[model samples]
Target chain A: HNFGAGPAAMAKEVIEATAKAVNNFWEGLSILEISHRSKEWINVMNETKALMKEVMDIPEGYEILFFGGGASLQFLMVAMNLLNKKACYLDTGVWASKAIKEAENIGEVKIIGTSKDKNYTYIPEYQIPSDYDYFHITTNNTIYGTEIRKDIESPIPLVADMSSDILSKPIDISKYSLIYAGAQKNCGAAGVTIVIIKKEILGKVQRKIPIILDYQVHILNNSMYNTPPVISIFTVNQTLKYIKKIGGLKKIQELNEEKARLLYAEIDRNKIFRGTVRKKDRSIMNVCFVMEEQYKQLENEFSEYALQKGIIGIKGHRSVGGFRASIYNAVTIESVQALIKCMHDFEQ
Target chain B: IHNFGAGPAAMAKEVIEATAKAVNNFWEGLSILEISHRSKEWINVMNETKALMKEVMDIPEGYEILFFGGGASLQFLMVAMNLLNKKACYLDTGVWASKAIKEAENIGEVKIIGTSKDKNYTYIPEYQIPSDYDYFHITTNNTIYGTEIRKDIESPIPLVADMSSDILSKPIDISKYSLIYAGAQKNCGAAGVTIVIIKKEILGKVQRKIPIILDYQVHILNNSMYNTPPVISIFTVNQTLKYIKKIGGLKKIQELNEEKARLLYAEIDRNKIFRGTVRKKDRSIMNVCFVMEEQYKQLENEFSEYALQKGIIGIKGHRSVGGFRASIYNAVTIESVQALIKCMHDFEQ
Candidate 1:
């Protein structure tokens, strides 16, 4: 039932480890007391940087960054930093279109693909523009349940906003020139956004980069240029270490796929339930669905009834106008079965 | 071991307790992550926090308090974007001053009035302000290279200082500077919020389409709640200011801080292997930076390792000014300083 989308629940070990460290290792300086610039905290920063490198198996040229704001802020930062002459965006959801609009202010932005016609139920195929500096793609659409079939292959740099699905499964670090995620779902909390950028490609922008907006600033400073959200970063670091201890990416992806598969199977069995996303492009993480059109009253009843039964953070976004069971990375398989059982019980 | 990373550096114990409590109950609707900034509880927190800053700093009625995003780095750009009319004179003493100069260059013709870059900013250079500049900008204290601008000399133009590293560490004649800003990390509390003290009359002079989030006057009018503020950081800053006020404000804090710096520096100066990074006059009370002589670097490393073994935290200097840096923030007691000094002496340095 602890199926939050972001700033999501972390592993029990991370909490316990953090609780113990906050008292002892930090010299009675609770995690909050030790400033971001403190040597101990700085090492935490370094450890998290190293852990990110270890898990992602990031390419040699990629630099990891710890920006303390939400991924929404990355909409502005990614556009501002990467857009030198011109850029292209594929609008898979509301977020992508928003990014396209923000990127236009930086340079000439072309909407390579959009899913607005059938209400973004599909991740549209793109006609890659050769003249563009980069092509922006959102790997997993959080609001609308759609995931790209495979890695994008663009001649120019392939910049991806993989916020919701990052670290949940294995990814070819070399496939995308850059990848960024909010980490609320799979990794840590709301206060940090993780960035994996190709190092050799920066310094192309002409504007006087705002200190917080520059990738190289955090890269050069090792993400300690400013006082970051120390507490958030600490929690995130511990969470990553927990992820590796539980058998790394293979186990994680298997669990995620199994949970989603069970829920979708249950939806298919039920006569009332209808999956909003197309069958081919369905997100393995967030199982978004609704009751049939004639069962609108029952659908409304189910949303309320599910909330009463401890089904948490499972509202489908407005664009979809249906119920969503976001069986994300941290969502336990038992919780998915619980929801499925609830549906079966309701049907009987 | 005074962790001198800034406000997020060495916070009071209670603040962390409150923050941890919030994190534990994050599943609740009112968790810090999902809390509506417009909610009454947080709104009260915001209002009370500003009042505390005003009370502790003794800011006058005309001065408005604002808590913005981007720390003082972004605030430097905001200050220039708002106030840089014809030209602004910048005093480049250290790293922050350099950033201030860079941001202001986008606004107008900026005059470089003084620079410590001549000697790697070991000291704040003495210089005369030209008559034609719109205002003078100075860094209150260089965090990387430890130095401070203690007094405000008479100047023809208005003076705005980047006081991120040292706004409340000591008392200043707030009347002298047109604007003063601080990031909430060192003396304040946490990292998410920035505190700006600006005279009400000085704003509205510059007409630029600045974002509402970064606008100093916009934040001042809203009492630092112009946007979704870093609410938890602001809450901690409020608690810390309460502690500061209870300890008799910055005047008394100055005495304690100087004593801590004096004891540590005295030990370093006497140590054969240890040496100071900046000029003596320009040394920072908050962060006492030093390194070992060429032949004595090994001894310095051993001493640092020994100090760490003895439970000293963050005694290593920043890489740019390498060796050792004892960052003694307000919460770092004199006992800690004496303990670190004793460790140095025990090694017979």
Candidate 2:
């Protein structure tokens, strides 16, 4: 109920697990006192990193790495390593274009296609430019609530920022040169981002990039070069186990489809609410919408009532106006039902 | 035993073991360093960390939580860069606030609304806040001078408090403020993650393009996951947060905290050999600042050397606030406070 967009709602079980660790542990120190270089924290770091491969089924050649900074930072980092003269971008939303803008800072940018005119509500078809080093795209747009359901195989390589929705379904990991996700919505708590890059594909860019910004830095240190966000990551480790316990991505996809279908279908049927995204490109994780016609007051009324009723985290973005229901990988079926019931009651 | 040097100060032994387990098991025969952040293991830690944090703080709805790097110092630059649409007013209570004012200069215009600099930042200043500014910035506690802003007063504008040293020491009505930023090292977790609590509406209104790292909206939307994060610091903070939740959140913690402060302040007041540094009413609960009599100046070095020999940690104060400073975070036991008092009494004898 506290937050909706990100750091949404942590599961009750995870909260309890942390609460149990209040007293001194085996190390004779309270959990917060120890050093980052210590073995205990290192173990948590290693185990959490290992789960990335398990969740996404990322193959052997692709390296799984976590680092400081979010996907917006990664857009330049990926470009700094992979882009040569010009990079291609499939602009889907603000962040995607923003990613390209960052790339423009480091190198040249070739925006092959864009849906900016439609306020990024739909993902239009676009081919990668031939002369560019690689193609870039945001897989899931959280603001506009659109997702590229199918992969875009680039002539050179494809780079994707999967911040909004990662591992909600199966994907061909080999199609992209590099893929990264900020661990907020679908991954961990915050402060860390995940990157999956080909081992053989780096060391091609001309600009001088520091080891901190290079994928090789994480590749070399295995992601522990500095004092990282251990707790948020450890929480994510628990999330991974939960996902695995529920039968990995296959089951997750099924649950996600049912969750999205139910919400989207209801929006279509509802008088006051309508999805902002086009039907074909709707994101299963983030179901975005606004009020129909002049139902502006409905947005404020529903948001205030639902928040008070313990069915929290549902507030539409201000830019597009109205409301949005972000049904991520962890948002349970029961919670949505509670929200729906609240919505129906409010309507009546 | 000489541990307390602000937030990366000392550890509780058990939290270290938990972190070691995670780091060791993070990858397939690889370490926590080897696996990508996308790994299932780290993800669970992230979720649980956020979950447990919810237990400790009475966070209001419609707010966003983000765990980020660059320490709390970086948050000084970030908050201003993200929200400083017009002019931002900073209440300079101490050196950290001064530093924050300077760093905020990298982004926009800064107006100093109030300052305790005239009194060496020994007291919290009282002044009228400008209503037209973007946000009113205040450092809740001055660790160097050992003073604090005990409550979230009625502000003419949205308040942005940099609560580095005094967070979790007590509970305040957080709903009144538009934003709160804390360096994880002092009260929350470790040194790396900076906790940013923002009113969702106030963000994204500032002009100028902020990089993703500097952009509050970007980090807020992603929950501070926009980049690689400080892992171990956040892990330990989770442990600290667990303790906070178990101790009955801030209400109970404040009771214990006040008791600890009163007991030690009584000891300081009674002990004439050593005089208190800050004004009696303005002393810090976290760090007790004091000085020997003018006649004892000759033995100041000996006092420091003797304490270090006794395994007493971080007893020295900033050169400006010359004397000794005993940092008593939640981890510092009441027994330790008594022990310091004993050391002073014994020295006087």
Candidate 3:
């Protein structure tokens, strides 16, 4: 069971499909060899976008665009393309702070709320002022294991970095002006980032955006402005197809909740372990925990034991020392149970 | 079989197989897509990849090898943002070169020292690099026009070249240039990653505040892991680099490329129905451009259909330069080039 965050687990079927496409996509041509403008690849791109819209229930106002760099690149781009005068941000964790820092480089950024006082264990309270150019949020913090579960009803245009949590549940697409997610977790793999932008919010910024950074150029070209990350995009297409096949985000949300619920329950019940983060702000995508204070010396022991039982990537991030099991859209409930059993067996 | 598309070009069969295997299981029951970029396994992969690239190119000390997303098109802006201090000169050979000039003009003073636009970019223009300028930029190989600068040019200032279509096709003097970049689609492995080789001393002279993602220094300092890289693409590139090493590096690869180009260009000259498009001395060994002879111009479409019937793909020319372009990159075998020539000969019959 692989639980390493970001480039986390993927469905077996999606992996099989990617492997086949890598060998021969069309007429003795590997998918990696086909041109982005070829009819076959264009069909794949179009179908991928359509399926993204279908699974996410995105509306007509949004234009779906795929970019090469990860969400880290979007931190600079969102500010370049959309930051008119100033932006408001809610700094919940590392990613949110990074987004705010990039926006500050472009224009004024007001951090309206932050949970850093407690090492970002909870979501901070903030009132969105209507005067700001946009309100930005990191929908889920993979590092600190905290999440904003509901969409924010902001007075200004809303933008989100949903890198860890997009497609884990249904989202109200009309509420935000922009939503961007790196496709490593639930969407697909690394190398591609998806941006869902409302077409009307662009063209207002005064900065002379470079053609590569300009969202409008990509929209006009329909994401074929340059050669895209073909293999990564193909993986995303396959993953989305899997999402559609197993029912949409609603079913994914159900399965994810079950997996997280089972794992969190074990952490709460186990004598040597305890869940981290405030219960109300706990992330369903990433369930983080650490050993109880009395059993802290045995943390290394439990990790080694878990490895023996074939539970990989359960160790927590270096910043937050503990265990973190990222049960994304593809992580099976059986895997969650396996982790729980490892925890229980370690107690003996 | 071969794919001769302008980019997203062919890969060695061994490379494709290894990539497919990695996609399924890279290590320890984790697909390459599923492994963390920070993991020990991935760190080794990254280090070995850089080492292989360095050894393959014979890149010397004081130069950095960085991989980025967003292809050479994005590098158009990145090159200017990082290197264009005050005024820079560019030699416009084709569309890619002109595009680089346009992007640089957005950043600082830009002078077109020379251009081949008058003749529709069929030849390389001669230009003198002024010592007063910050740098001189050139597109080493113009994929569209099928022209190439086969030798290293001495520059008074820093030299930056976009080798997108033909970086690894032949050996070049790495120490002669200050910066070199290539999109990985053509001769490298796959799309999505761009490889940049830069001389360390030429950076940090620009006055503008570059965004971190656009900053080459930031990427170099972090060793291309300032953010999550295109893992799978880099993996494929690593596999391709290993293949190159196994096949005896650039010297061997260059011999094969020259032979393929020689065969195709010879047939283009001999097959009375067709004529080479570019200046003979400057024709690209990577992208071979040709057209139906003036008297047989009406047979262009017929020859295209004939080539398609013979299992050839992506031989169609760009709309700007009508006729045919056969991009025989490193992975395109001599057999495939012969197949294309046979198609031409059969069409003439």
Candidate 4:
């Protein structure tokens, strides 16, 4: 079981399909070799966007754009395009802080709330000011294993960095002005970032955005303003197709909840381990936990034990020292059981 | 048997298969798609890729190789944003250079010192690079018009070149240019990532507040991991770079490339029905553009169909300039060129 966080696990079918395309996508041309301007690739781009809209239940009037720089780039884009005067952010974790930092460089940014007081173990309480140009939030914190499970009602335009947890559950697409995800997690791989933007939300900012960073330009060009990450976008198409085939986000959410539930139950029950985040704020995608204080000395042994059992990438992030089983949409229920069983055996 | 697409062009069989295998399972049962960019394995891949580029191109000590997304078009804006203090000069060879000039004009003052637009971009234009400008920009190869500057130009100001289509096909004096950027899909690898080799001292000079992602200084400081890079794109680039090194590096690659270009161009010249576009001296070795002789102009579609029947792919010229463009990048085999030549000869019959 591979459990590393974003560039996280994906379905085997998707990988196989991606590999086959990489070898020869069309007429002896490797997917890596085909021109982005070719009719074949334009079809791929169209079909991928169509599928994204369908899978996410995105309504009309929303433009889905793919870009090269990850959500890190979107941090600047959201502010440059949307923040005419100022923007407000809820600092949930490291990624949120980073997003805030980038937005600060663009315009005035007010961090309305943060969970930093308790090391970001919980999502903070905040009021969205109607006066701000936009309200920004990181829907899920990969490092701290916390998430905003429900859509926040924003007084102004809402923007989100859902890089770690976009499609893991049902999203109320109509509730937000813009949503962006780095496709390394539930969506696909690392190169491309998906931006779902309401058409009316752009072209309002006062800043003179660079042509490359302008979302309006991408929308005008149909995301082909420049050469897209063809192979990466192809992989994302395959991954999304797999998602549709195996039942849409609703089924994915059911499976993910089951997996996270199993792992969290084991963490709670096992004498050696305990869950990291508060129960309500705990992330289903990244189930973080650490060895109980009394059993802390055996953490290394437990890691080795898990690895010997064919488990990999279970090591926690370096910043937050503990194991994190990132049970994203593609992580199997059986793998969660394996992790739970490993925890149980370790306790004994 | 061959791919001659303008870009996201051909690659060696070894590179394609290795990239596929890596996609399936890179290391320890993790797909290359699934591995963390910060992991020791991927970091090594990134480091080795930079090293391979440095070695193959013989890049000097002052330059730093960085990877980014958004292809060469993004670099067009970045070049101006990072370097254009007051005014910059550009040599407009073709559409790509024109686009670069247009984007730079959005940032600051831009001067077109020389241009071949009068001839529909059929030849390289000569211009003196004024030292008064912040920098001078050139598109080393114009893919659309099939023109290229085969030799490095001596610039009084800092030199910047978009070597997107012809990079790694031949070696160049890296020290002459302050910055060289290429979209890797053509000569390097796949489409998603762009390789930027920059003279570190040239950056941090522009007064504008560049966005974190657009700022080359930020990317250089982060070692191109300022964000999660196009992981799979960079990985393919690494494999392509390794393949170049294994095949006797740039000198050998250049020899093969020249041979392919020579064979095809020779046939284009010899074939009665066809004539090469662009000035003879300025024709691009990477993208060989040709058109039917005026007497045989009516047979253009017939020749295209004939070539297609013979399994020639992407020989159709760019729509902007209607003719044929056989883009024989570094990986385009001499055998493939011969196949194309045979198609042309048979079409003549």
Candidate 5:
């Protein structure tokens, strides 16, 4: 099983489809050669947007835009298109901090709450003020294994960076004014980021938005403002199709919950390992753990052992020194079981 | 088959096959599409792609080659945001040049040095470019009107060129221009990646507080890894660049391009049913545009359909031009051009 933080894993079916697309696409043109303006790719664009809306259960008032540059670009774009005067952010981890820094360039930004005091091992809780134009949050912290497990209502327009955790489970569309996620994790490939925003909320800002960064321009152009990342989006559609075929978000969430439960149980029961985040705030998508004090010396050995036993991307992020099992949507329960088995054998 | 749409055009067969294999399993045994962009394998792709461009283009010591998500269209605004400080001069030769002008107008005072609009952009116009402007801009090739500024212009100030449709099809002096950008859909690779080659010294002049994504300095500092770039596109672009080096560099590729264009243009000139659209001196070797002779113009649709049946793909001309354009880019072979010429000869007989 492969499990990096993001660009993590994809459904086997999607991978096969992408491989096939490189040789011969639907119209006998390789996906690489087709023009973004052609009916062939335009249809792919429309279908992917429709599929995104359908799979995520995005409401009618919302628009789904796929663009190049990852969620990091969204850090600046979200501010440019929306931040008129002031915005508030909950700094849960690195991604949120970056988003806040980008927003600061546009207007006044306040850190409403932060979990950095505890090394970001728990989700920060704070009241959203009505004074701010919008309140932002990173729904999941991949590096720290902390997640805002439920959707929160904000007194202001709520923007959520769902980069690491989007589509792992069902998210309430009505609660968020904007939700942006990079496609690497649960969505699909690494090239595109999916931004779903409330249509009515745009164009109120007085700033002159660049054509590429303007949400209104993208929404009006059907996300074809510039040639979008076609291959990434096609793979994303395939991933969405896979999600729909496998009983949609609800069933996947249940499976995801069970997978997290199985692995977390192993970490708790095993004498050599311990979970990183607080129990209530643990991310179902990314399960982070470290070796117990006496077993700390065996950390490198256990990592090596896991690597020899067919585990990929299980190593901890460099910023945090502990193993992380990012069991995204495509990760099977069998894979989780295999990981647990490795933990058990290593424990012995 | 002669295949020539505006862009997202042909790629070499071996390059396509290599791209296919890489897509299935990169060196690390993961699908290139699924692998993390920050992975060593992908980072190798990143560095190798940059290095290949630098070597192939004979880029100088201070120039940095950066890749980005938005095509040349996005570079239109990026160029404006990053470089346009006080005033800029624009040479309005074709649609793309005009688009660049429009975006730059949003930022600084823009003076149109010259425009071919009176002639529907059928030729490149000559005019005085004042030294007072920050920089003068030009679109190197007009894909629609089939005109090309084939040589590097001597600008009193910095020069910027949008080489979107004609980059890598020929050799040029890279030092004369402050920046050169091209959408990779043409001769380079796929449609998703835009290659920007800029002099390291030209940036940070604009007074606007540029957004980090729009800022060239930020992209340079991050080595174009600020955000996850279009990885598949960059990989394909690298494959094309590698092919260019193997077949000899741009000089050899330029000779092949000229040969292909020469045969096609000769046929267009000799055929009874056709007439080249642009003046011979200003005609582009990239997009060989010609229409049916005035009386036989009615056969345009029939000829297009006939070419389609004859295994020619994307030979249809720009709608504004109303004829045919054989985009004989680097991937196009002399045999394909001959095949197209044969089609014209058969029609003539």
Candidate 6:
């Protein structure tokens, strides 16, 4: 059973191909030493973008960028380009609060909805004002194990940080002006980040963007404005190919739901365990849970038991202090079943 | 055979093998490419890589080393964002040098102390640094023009350098400069990682609010772990650095590099079919620029084609300057240089 936060498990097929690529890339050159300007790399770049568009059904005006820095860099870039007057944010968990903090450096930010009043256990409802330039959201909160499962329609532009849940399920493209994901978890590895943005929305703000940090620069150059993390991009393409070959997002989403259902069923029936998130808000990507109040002292004991059973990365984030089983898209139903069996064995 | 593309140049054989091994199976049999950066094994890679860089470069105390993505292009903007408070001085040698200056101009006032543009950048020009400037900047080696400053110049102000192309081909006094940055595609490693060495005192002077990713202080505080780094490139760099240590250090590398440049320049001087482009004293040991004799200018593409037939690659010059530029970064062997020399000799005969 494999369940880490980000830099999580990748499909074995994708990993194996990536390993083979490192030693001998196209035309007898090691991908490790080939120039980004090489024809082989340029082809890889073009093909990956094309495949992403096909898989996601991206519209004509949208541009895709695969870049070096992770989503943390995007936290600053999103506001630098969009925060002309004011922006609104939803503080669902730690990552959303970070997005809000970085934006506050550029312009005014209002937190319209927050779950902190309940220790971020649920998604709080809020009003969206038409006065703000845009509304920003974290679609899935990994630390809190809650997700905004529906595609949101805002009166203004809607932006989302979908780092944990993207590509696991089909998303409505028309509802968003932009969406970004760090590739470590559901997409590929840890070194690269993916940005999907509609072209028309850029060049609206008065501020000058640093060329490296600017999304427009990346789009114009096709993510080769500077040297990108070459190996990361190569492996991400492999993962996308795997997804398409095994049917599309529609089929994967069903399997994802089934895996989550199996684990949650065990958590509900088992006397010692209980889920941490509100019932309706629980994430299909990251299933967070803990021991029941009466059995709380056995938390470390059960964690050791699971560890001996070869279940890894089940530790929760320090901020939430319990356990998190991040069953991302690459995680199989059988792995979840194995985890369920571990829970039963613990109770016996 | 010589393979001389500018950055992403040829690498040491051992380093390439090590990289292949890591990719296939690292610790615990996980492909190094897919493992978590937070894993203990990955952490050792990061620390060991940094320590090796410090030991090899002989970097002074109170300086911080960081590895990041976007290479020298991003470092151009990051340097300005962190250090360009009021005014900075720049020496415009070639494309990269000019690019750095352009980015700094967007942040604050910039004074170009010198430029080699009048002579098509065929020579390194001498310049006087102003004490009033915040920092005097220089590109230690100009890859396109094939001119390099071989010795450290005493700066009246804080000194900064972009040593991307010729970083490990020779040794330099680390204590002399306030900052030194290099993209790892040439002498060090692969395409993705950029190395930054910044003195602790040179920061916190900028008035502008630097983005968390661009700020040197923030990166230092987090040990370059402010974000996930380019692991494949970084691991390649570690292997490269280990190779460097194995074959003695920069002293031997510099001697070997000098011999390669000397042999190539000698051929251009002796052959009727070729003539050196840059000034002899200022010519780079890393990138060797040359052209056919003035009367034989029409034979340019023909000679390049001939060299390629002889197993030489990437000897084509920049579009701005046409003829040939044979990049002989650290990993290029003296044997390859002799082979290139022999091919030109055979062409002339």
- Per-residue CA lDDT of model 4 for A18-53, tens digit only, reads 755444558656788787888888998999989988
Error of 4 at A171 (Å): 1.5
Q: Report the lDDT tens digits of candidate 4 across residue range B122-180.
A: 98877888889999999999988899999987887899999999988888999899999
Interface RMSD of each: 4.0, 8.6, 1.1, 1.4, 1.8, 2.0
Which candidate comes out best when scored by DockQ? 3
Give stretches of model 6 more than 4 Å off.
Answer: A19-26, B21-27
Clashes of each: 8, 97, 0, 1, 0, 0
DockQ of predicted model 1: 0.20
Give the per-residue lDDT digits (tens) of candidate 3, residues A1-348.
878787888998898888654555576678888888899899999999999999999999899999998999999999999998888999999999999888888889999999999888899889998998899999999988999999878888999999999999998999989999999988998999999999999998986788888999999999989889999998999999999999889999999888888887888889788787999999999888877885665466888888989988878877777888888988898888888888898885
- Work out how many backbone clashes candidate 6 has: 0
DockQ score for model 4: 0.74
Better of 1 and 3 by lDDT: 3
lDDT of 3 at A112: 92
Better of 5 and 6 by DockQ: 5
Candidate 3: tens digits of C-alpha lDDT, residues B204-233: 999977888889999999989999999999
| Predicted structure with the largest TM-score when compared to the true one | 3
- Which is better, 2 or 3, measured by lDDT? 3
Tens-digit per-residue lDDT, B80-171, candidate 1: 87888777898998777888788788667888978888787788798898887777888878887888766655666777888777778887
Q: Is the docking of candidate 4 incorrect, acceptable, medium or high quality?
A: medium
True contacts kept of 5: 0.57
| Lowest lDDT 10-residue stretch of candidate 4 chain B | B20-29
TM-score of chain A of 4: 0.97
Relative to the true structure, candidate 3 has a C-alpha RMSD (angstroms) of 1.4
The Cα error of candidate 4 at residue B214, in Å, is: 1.9
List the lowest-lDDT window of 10 residues for candidate 2 chain A.
A19-28
Candidate 6 pairs with clashing backbones:
none
